[PDB]
Design a protein around this ligand. Structure first.
Ligand code: T8T
Ligand code: T8T
Ligand code: T8T
Ligand code: T8T
Ligand code: T8T
Ligand code: T8T
Ligand code: T8T
Ligand code: FE
Ligand code: FE
Ligand code: FE
Ligand code: FE
Ligand code: MG
Ligand code: MG
Ligand code: MG
Ligand code: MG
Ligand code: MG
Ligand code: MG
Ligand code: MG
Lengths: 459, 451, 452, 458
């Protein structure tokens, strides 16, 4: 068993250790070839055909670069081949839990199909990782290459989903290893760096963030009795620009008005198909689209394929679901009516989403009257990854003249031209009735609703 | 109105409303579910791109080249109608591709149905006919000034060639319109230009060919009482490099040893699934993977999805097909045994595993255990130099077409323009079987005086 | 005929024969010998690009935008003549740059000649006049359908603004004045070329899609004037354009060391100024600081002046040559600190004296550099986007305004700030320590932010 | 003294050890900022403003990557920090000898100005490296960071120019491979090529087909003829034929562009007319000419592309002839291409060719008769870097199944679509008299000359 090399358009030649190859060459990992990174984004940006598989390889590769680089610069950290392998495995496996159309699945479908459960694709990744290990005899292969499976499986999981020192996989003196793949402190992790580059390459938008530079300048210093990753103070401006780029990719691509409408329609189709579709899990037991998340053998076979299974079906019980997807192909989509924003420092909460179409329909501003069933109200939260908080206040820096002393850099020390808030909310309204007289009316309800709630007058 | 689409290769592509109506059909949107490079994606993870994107790009580039000839030479009398027809042909030229693209017409259909002669291009014509007829496109064409009887014929002829001037869609004085999307004279067409750029972008290999430059320098001149596209004489070196790039993309990516083995395995899985899978066509009639090419309503639903349908199946009659695809996920692939060089004709492909298995070198193995992959590497015209079939003009006389021979360009160019490679693989992957398979292979090579 | 030029930023650029005649003059070819980013090249080794390349690119982009407005809206009655004039203005808009570009009009001339008010744009107009008059271009213009009196005025007005305030073109072609140098809001093709080109060469990636902006640009009536309007959808991308510009200033153009190198070159030029002779019209001799008064002399004033000084043996140039030798050895002046308030151009000269008078080795005003850096959105305290007109899909001739609250609550609350950096010319341990003490006391004395 | 980081558009963040910084921050190195990589190419391809300085940093960086990567993959090679520093210094300094407008200077000007001497920019690089060391107190700085200057200076020089039975003194046979990184004498596959392909492409606006990063990942060291050499993975053989293809392709389109070469010829003409009147101050205040400054590195230090502008901006009447030639470049009244043809003609015969053309007696046309001074005859050699030889026959490969056994791969084992020849020669003729009647005549002399020497009808 040797090294394999994989050519990636974002990263070039990626070297994979034989243990990583064994993990990649499983049904649980190869599944990611059949789930698009950007979901309904592909129906607006035709370049965005990229799947989670490619992304996952890239996060494994970048997880490895950052840990290797900290190791070469600071030998006193005593970063081991074992540490490197575990960090790479976590990068490779961090997105195993994604479902059909990625963000659509955990952002839209599961909260509507199963309001009782709290599910994240990250929880899924842990469960799918457990299934992958156990059903492909990976524990002995790990031992062969010097890993200790009890400690290291825990470590890999904790890197994906998170956990007085709360972690068991590695002690405080390797705390920094937990900032690479998924950074809970501030969000600055290699996962972001891969998706910015990859999404850009494919969308046809250009990426402003130099991850290779950030890596060269990263050191480990002591902060609050913990060894953490610190950035060179000089790079502070570039980190505010990293979040700016992320928010900019959300505005243009990920929350595109039509991409979101297509995700909403697919979600609608899935909800109508949910009672009739059967996915075979462990012991031949049958699961639904919404329950396959409870059985990883079933979940393994739940991919973007589900879209085509519904579209190509002839069963009359799937007629409603299939008609929604047929309307996507013909491009008879629901129609955008307008966008607006809360002026209040209080955002609209998930509890209130269901009641919004009713509120719009009750606006008393007309030819055609319209009903709550005719409106979609899409509520979009845009932030810097920590609700109302500035992520950069949670970043540690060093200076050239004292590279072991960690410091904080406040927002006033960087620039007066930076954002005064780090979270905002956008509300888009669409209409399901698409003729001239209905759209005109829908727009009237929308503007009056905006006046009724002291929201921003629309464009 | 117009719609704008952002593409990573071409930037902002403007689509006329008629083109939008054609794109927004099930027959076109189907191309979202067929990978450009098929099994290449299982070697080059960037190659997730599908035929849909490519098809938009050929529509766009077909439009650039025809617009540019029109602006430079108004005397050609290129009409908005001509432009729309050329764009529609670029959009629709790849409608006939099946699951995993080249795999489908290169490997599967010739094995599943040896009696028929099928190309994805014939498929594109049939799928175009189905698309028109089932989406009420003829009246939309008339609305924007096309004449459907003439123009549908013209669009088809652009895709597949004619159906002693052989064409009906357009007369001799617009002959050049037939060289844009699919060039039968020499292969220099916008379809190549899109795939070089797109495949490169995604594979992670860099493209040496500047199509935008070629377009700026393209003119139409009279050659043998026919108006054809000519290249600026200065560009001759760049055209030899275009074919060099194509052949280079075949060596590294398209005929990758493992990419081809994965295509062979998928093909194997399809042959074992063929008798048991049902695809619903017109009037509810059922078709097989290999027969869906006879019914375009069925064919519409035959995409890369078929791979997952087989993989996720529980039916025992699909166990054999499903096990082959499961071995792809585990990466227990068929194993490369060796490569060699003579040409061997398509007529002989089926009989080659038998020939290998009959080698008696100084575990025995059977013909079912060997794959013999015959790979033709050329400049798109068998043994011929495509550039001998290119017309050029000079700066000082831009209407006089000329030929440029190979000795006038460089003594460092290829002496031949076609060669053939034969690879052998084994389906039995253990130590003792591979060793044997290698012995059969070398003795076979000695038996046929190959390298 | 036409010539084609391959550019790494724009691909194949087509040049009409009249534009070739303008390019093939000493006054234009001069721009091959002036670096776009000046002292930036001594920090970012990719930034070897010169103003010539940039100038071709602005000519090309000026042409794309005007051609595209013409194809989309024939009712504008944009003529081949209008197109040629806009292209010529793009080609010639940067003719006035001096040695090391921004250094020359930002730093050297205000110090060498405080009495005069000079911009490279005024220079471009004068150099354009010289180019025309000394290369017999007026009859060549007439040959290809221009009307030189009207059109020369038009080209100049495109570069520098008015000299309805315009004479070269009436109100119904107002929009032609927004292409090369946009006085209303700063959104012009000149920005677009430098973002792309600077990025390509610096090794930083450009976030702004100029080709997209062009596809979406229309002309609509605003206040009885036909202006360029952007598609409403693009408002977010325009805030990001200014964000990108400001980002290129933070990282590259105002790099601490790039600015120190510009300051050192400026210092060398000030010491060489009285001893250099550049031959102008009538054989009259000009200095580096006076060559801006005579375009024949100015023609021969390029980055070459740096090497002339560096390679000299003349004792009168010893002081200037020693400063430039210290740049090669990399014995640069040393950064002491940064701070923030605004300080006006009138006050720049007096600042080293103010620092040296701070009472916290003693040090003197000649020992300090005080570099005042203005970071804004190109209109001082103003939001440029409040001065942009937009159209909607549903009514593409109705122009509208879009306020900042309609776009995003995550946008800047301010559009201008000022940074002050201090450096010391005396580089030993004891001097730097002292220099830092003067600096912090000065900051306390003027109620500036205690330094990082 | 620490590390410095430099951002390069081709290579990204380049790390430079303090010793390398000391070498870079000298007048002898910084000089390369004032010499364009592609010379007269910039007057055809406006993107090609790049100078030798940037290139030189890039070769230092790539020299370092390749040696570091061989070291990480094969610890048994015993590659030292010292070996790495020496290879990097050689990459940084390999182009120190270039003169004004790069190839123009050693290809055209010096062979015409000083036919007696044999000069290459590489000899210059060695001499300039010696001057750089000696005049900037670098020997002690080298010792500070663990180099041994007598051995290591020799090693660095030998890497640049070749040796000065195992011919090398700087390093023994077991580190032979270190000599293949910067300038490969065996086959030409070196990091110097890799930097210029990428950089030239980036700037010219032509796209690069060669993946140097891939080549590096696949490079190993194996034993060949009792010597440890760099070997390529057998699978990469096709990509190496494509590397030479790309080089030859960059020569056809950019480096030997008809007008780029004419501009180099005009600059050379201007330099020859200025050579007697320009004075460059060298060591001890002794004065050198443009053509003699190559004999004194203190003078040579101040000889850059600046010399072009010094001549252009001059007012001295003795420089009027030289200055008028350069003024004609700005106005674009260039010398005019008359024609091209193909046979080889040897360097010994270049000088005599304009005379041969002018002696052609064409069947009695001729308004204007023309003289040898009126013709330029440009002889252009297009090859794979080894005259008539296939460089790939001089490459060693390994297989996956035996990565320590080196092998050869013949051309028939790779492809029947590869070149049958690896060298050809082009002859271009130009005329200095540019009016309609002169060009027509010049073309008549040219075709008769071609008939007289049995060359291809043009
Ligand atoms: N950029 C690039 N150029 C190429 O020429 C090329 N060829 C392949 N690849 C990509 C495809 C893959 O992403 C990666 C590995 O390809 P490889 O062909 S070295 O590997 P194995 O077939 O496994 O050969 P073995 O088993 O004998 O070592 O490089 C390439 N990528
Ligand atoms: N029509 C279409 N087909 C595709 O296959 C496709 N792929 C990407 N895009 C891009 C191009 C489109 O601009 C974008 C959104 O689709 P749209 O325009 S239909 O939907 P709204 O804007 O809500 O409706 P309208 O303009 O009719 O009022 O997606 C596409 N658009
Ligand atoms: N490069 C780029 N930057 C962007 O900011 C951007 N925004 C969208 N796209 C891509 C996505 C598509 O491929 C294309 C069109 O997206 P569009 O937002 S203009 O259009 P419709 O939604 O149809 O809006 P309407 O109906 O009001 O005209 O550009 C973009 N592409
Ligand atoms: N991208 C690119 N590829 C190339 O192969 C190439 N060759 C040249 N150029 C660049 C160099 C220039 O920037 C431009 C045109 O050079 P050109 O060789 S078409 O033309 P003239 O010398 O003018 O030949 P004539 O007088 O017969 O037209 O393209 C090229 N640019
Ligand atoms: N090195 C350097 N220091 C500086 O302080 C500086 N300031 C500008 N530049 C460089 C960066 C660019 O390459 C160029 C910008 O100047 P141009 O004359 S093409 O246009 P404007 O109308 O001045 O710019 P805008 O409208 O955005 O204010 O000069 C600078 N470069
Ligand atoms: N790509 C990129 N992004 C940037 O934001 C950027 N900023 C600078 N550079 C380039 C400029 C140089 O090529 C390189 C390092 O510049 P640096 O600003 S880290 O370094 P010193 O000023 O020497 O500061 P110290 O001594 O305090 O570490 O990166 C940059 N390159
Ligand atoms: N303008 C121009 N004309 C030319 O004839 C020419 N020839 C080379 N160059 C440019 C092209 C490159 O930028 C560089 C090549 O010369 P270098 O000193 S970096 O290395 P070598 O060892 O000579 O190259 P190799 O080993 O491949 O034969 O000079 C040229 N540039
Ligand atoms: Fe991820
Ligand atoms: Fe195609
Ligand atoms: Fe400018
Ligand atoms: Fe070199
Ligand atoms: Mg995730
Ligand atoms: Mg995250
Ligand atoms: Mg096809
Ligand atoms: Mg074809
Ligand atoms: Mg300017
Ligand atoms: Mg401006
Ligand atoms: Mg060299």
């Amino acid at each position: 068993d040797t090294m394999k090399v994989i050519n990636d358009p974002i990263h070039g030649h990626i070297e994979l250790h034989p243990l990583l190859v064994r993990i990649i060459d499983t049904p649980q990992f190869q599944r990611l070839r059949y789930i698009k990174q950007l979901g309904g984004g592909y129906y607006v940006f035709p370049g965005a055909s990229h799947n989670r598989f490619e992304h996952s390889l890239g996060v494994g590769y970048l997880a490895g670069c950052l840990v290797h680089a900290l190791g070469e610069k600071q030998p006193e950290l005593q970063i081991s081949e074992r540490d490197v392998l575990c960090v790479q495995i976590a990068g490779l496996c961090h997105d195993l839990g994604h479902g059909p159309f990625s963000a659509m699945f955990d952002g839209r479908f599961i909260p509507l199909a199963r309001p009782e459960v709290k599910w994240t694709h990250e929880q899924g990744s842990v469960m799918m990782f457990e299934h992958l290990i156990n059903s492909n005899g990976i524990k002995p292969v790990m031992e062969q290459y010097g890993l200790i499976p009890e400690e290291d499986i825990c470590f890999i999981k904790e890197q994906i989903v998170g956990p007085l020192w709360p972690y068991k996989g590695r002690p405080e003196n390797k705390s920094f290893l937990y900032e690479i793949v998924s950074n809970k402190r501030n969000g600055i992790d290699v996962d972001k760096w891969d998706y910015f580059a990859r999404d850009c390459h494919h969308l046809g938008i250009q990426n402003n963030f130099d991850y290779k530079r950030f890596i060269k300048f990263a050191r480990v210093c002591e902060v609050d009795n913990e060894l953490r990753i610190c950035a060179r103070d000089k790079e502070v401006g570039n980190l505010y620009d990293m979040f700016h780029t992320r928010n900019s990719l959300h505005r243009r691509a990920y929350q595109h008005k039509v991409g979101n409408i297509i995700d909403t329609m697919i979600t609608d189709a899935f909800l109508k198909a949910d009672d009739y579709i059967e996915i075979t899990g462990a012991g031949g037991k049958k699961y639904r689209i919404s329950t396959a998340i409870d059985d990883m053998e079933a979940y393994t076979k739940l991919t973007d394929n589900i879209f085509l299974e519904i579209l190509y079906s002839t069963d009359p019980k799937l007629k409603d679901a299939r008609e929604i997807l047929k309307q996507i192909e013909y491009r008879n989509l629901f129609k955008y009516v307008g966008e607006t924003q809360p002026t209040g420092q209080i955002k609209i909460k998930r509890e209130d989403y269901e009641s919004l179409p009713k509120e719009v329909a009750s606006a008393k501003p007309l030819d055609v009257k319209l009903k709550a069933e005719d409106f979609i109200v899409d509520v979009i939260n845009m932030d810097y990854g920590m609700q109302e908080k500035n992520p950069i206040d949670h970043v540690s820096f060093y200076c050239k003249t004292a590279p072991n002393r960690a410091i904080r850099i406040t927002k006033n020390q960087v620039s007066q031209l930076l954002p005064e808030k780090f979270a905002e909310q956008l509300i888009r309204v669409y209409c399901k009735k698409v003729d001239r007289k209905s759209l005109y009316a829908a727009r009237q309800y929308f503007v009056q609703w905006c006046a009724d709630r002291n929201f921003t007058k629309p464009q």
